[PDB]
């Protein structure tokens, strides 16, 4: 019961990291529980096969078709903690009111990335006269990826240029000219450099 002698490879500390800043946040919390749920959907229909062919050919079948019928749903994460101060509370509330907030949560050995707050509770009672109980909940915004695509270092890019949408308008700001045509103003702006 000495604690602070945390074994390696399983250090039970909850680290929450902002997804764009990549710096830890809300390290003032004292968490008491963590739950992870990873559901999926499996087909529930009788399904049909040919079933008079060679053995390995039929083994090639009954795959793929079984694969079409198992699709993973988002991960759900639940925690329970006690908040000692105020600044953490309003930081969490501000992150809640934003539509564009994502975090990566680390448990003892489980990594969940691209999460988002969906539910939050706060409770106050004589059981804690200088703290508040919290019940936060997250879900995974998007699934992880391993490789592929073309994340190049330099300007090189997959060059999406989908801009079939427009309605052209001529501006009026430029630089100066009140009684002068567009050509005069453009020529003057050019000769400025």
């Amino acid at each position: 019961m000495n604690s602070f002698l945390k074994s390696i490879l399983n250090t039970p500390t909850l680290t929450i990291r902002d997804d764009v800043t990549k710096l830890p946040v809300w390290k003032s919390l004292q968490v008491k529980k963590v739950e992870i749920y990873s559901p999926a959907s499996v087909v529930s229909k009788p399904l049909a096969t040919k079933d008079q062919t060679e053995a390995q050919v039929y083994t090639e079948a009954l795959d793929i078709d079984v694969k079409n019928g198992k699709i993973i749903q988002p991960v759900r994460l639940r925690i329970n903690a006690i908040c000692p101060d105020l600044s953490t509370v309003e930081s969490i509330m501000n992150a809640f009111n934003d539509n564009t907030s994502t975090f990566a949560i680390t448990s003892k050995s489980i990594l969940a990335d691209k999460m988002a707050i969906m539910t939050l509770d706060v409770d106050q009672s004589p059981d804690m006269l200088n703290a508040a109980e919290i019940n936060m909940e997250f879900e995974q915004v998007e699934p992880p990826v391993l490789n592929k695509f073309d994340p190049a270092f330099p300007q090189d890019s997959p060059t999406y240029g989908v801009q079939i949408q427009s309605l052209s308008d001529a501006n009026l700001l430029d630089l100066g000219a009140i009684g002068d045509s567009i050509s005069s103003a453009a020529k003057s702006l050019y000769n400025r450099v």
Binding site: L9, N10, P12, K32, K33, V34, E35, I36, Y37, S38, P39, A40, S41, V42, V43, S44, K45, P46, L47, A48, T49, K50, D51, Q52, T53, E54, A55, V57, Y58, T59, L62, D63, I64, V66, K67, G69, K70, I72, S107, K108, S109, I110
Partner: protein, 172 residues
């Protein structure tokens, strides 16, 4: 559960076996409970005199709920891989009962002050329901039936006429 009387001492309880390569996955799982549920619904019609008739019964896939303890990390991510797998069918052997065509449908890890060293987990499997549970196989590849592929496109996109043939018959 009676039935088999083997006199072997160190036998094996619940174990998941891969149905493709006859291999065990997550063999180091401390199992606590196993619950198996069967379900069916019988459609009934309400007659004229006052009685009520039943015409047929429909069977749905069964479900198995397993509660385990994970004594390490390798068991934990082995369980994660077991859930994420999309292609393999698994066969489950409980005490005396053997089931086939199951896939994992859930996983619920837990992290509590009650247990720090291990991790209490609760899995769930569901059966793939298929007609004709016992297949018919031929050992000769030529000795097999005829699949039917219908109305695709010639898809073109080919180099030339003379050059491909002059590569195919001249050899190069």
């Amino acid at each position: 559960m009676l039935g088999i009387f083997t006199s072997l001492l160190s036998s094996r309880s619940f174990s998941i076996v891969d149905q493709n390569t006859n291999q065990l996955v997550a063999a180091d799982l401390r199992i606590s409970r196993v619950n198996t549920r069967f379900s069916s619904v019988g459609q009934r019609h309400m007659l004229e005199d006052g009685t009520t008739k039943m015409d047929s019964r429909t069977i749905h896939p069964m479900e198995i709920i397993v509660e385990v303890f994970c004594p390490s990390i390798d068991v934990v991510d082995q369980i994660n891989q077991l859930l994420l797998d999309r292609d393999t069918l698994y066969k489950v052997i409980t005490r005396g009962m053997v089931f086939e065509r199951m896939m994992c449908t859930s996983e619920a890890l837990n992290q509590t002050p009650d247990m720090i060293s291990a991790t209490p987990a609760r899995l769930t499997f569901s059966q793939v329901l298929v007609q004709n549970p016992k297949p018919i196989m031929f050992r000769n590849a030529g000795d097999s039936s005829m699949i039917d592929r219908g109305l695709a496109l010639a898809e073109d996109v080919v180099g030339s006429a003379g050059d491909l043939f002059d590569y195919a018959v001249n050899g190069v």
